[PDB]
Amino acid sequence: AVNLCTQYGWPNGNYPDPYDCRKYISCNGAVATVMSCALGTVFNPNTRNCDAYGNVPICQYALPSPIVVTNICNQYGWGNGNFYHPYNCAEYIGCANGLTTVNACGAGQYYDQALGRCALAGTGYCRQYVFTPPPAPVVYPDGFDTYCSANNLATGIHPDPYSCFSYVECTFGRTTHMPCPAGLSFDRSLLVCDGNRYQNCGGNVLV
């Protein structure tokens, strides 16, 4: 347990505990220590920190097995496809028109979110937990409503330069912005919310 940080080739920081979402793995000095969130809070996979219960509905903290992602596709509105499991590198999630399937990789395999499939241990893996969260809350400057017009942006979808969890929409010069579904982040190349926080939120820089 104490060696998970180096096992996966992880930077120091906070990572999910796959058994108890009231706890988390603190990688500090390349050593893993399981830590407890203060009562009233649970580990938010998207902030990499403890957070109020209501911000993490997939953590049913009073339950035996408090991690409950078996309705996550409906809970957060995830589109069709495969996604990382927010608490467990060795599992993944399939969404089919709102229906969730919780899947497991084969023995000794780990889910690779970039490839969308499982593989045996490598040298630097479980990368889907390696990312820089945006601020919470994301503070927008007064006047951000000018963004589309000031940048002469075409009608449609654009990155949100304040948060990798969000995107901008431009409509006849009018600006709106919208967070991706919780756990998803904005792919600036394909202009869609997806499961690749590592690629969209600076994890490649951290490693």
Residue numbers in the entry: 21 to 227
From the paper:
Brown algae utilize phlorotannin as their chemical defense against the predator Aplysia kurodai, which uses β-glucosidase (akuBGL) to digest the laminarin in algae into glucose. Moreover, A. kurodai employs Eisenia hydrolysis-enhancing protein (EHEP) as an offense to protect akuBGL activity from phlorotannin inhibition by precipitating phlorotannin. To underpin the molecular mechanism of this digestive–defensive–offensive system, we determined the structures of the apo and tannic acid (TNA, a phlorotannin analog) bound forms of EHEP, as well as the apo akuBGL.
The structure of EHEP consists of three PADs: PAD1 (N24–C79), PAD2 (I92–C146), and PAD3 (F164–C221), which are linked by two long loops, LL1 (Q80–N91) and LL2 (R147– G163), and arranged in a triangular shape. The three PADs share a canonical CBM14 fold consisting of two β-sheets containing three N-terminal and two C-terminal antiparallel β-strands. Additionally, two small α-helices were appended to the N- and C-terminus in PAD1 and PAD3 but not in PAD2. The CNo1X15CNo2X5CNo3X9CNo4X12CNo5X5–9CNo6 motif (superscripts and subscripts indicate the cysteine number and number of residues between adjacent cysteines, respectively) in each PAD of EHEP formed three disulfide bonds between the following pairs: CNo1–CNo3, CNo2–CNo6, and CNo4–CNo5.
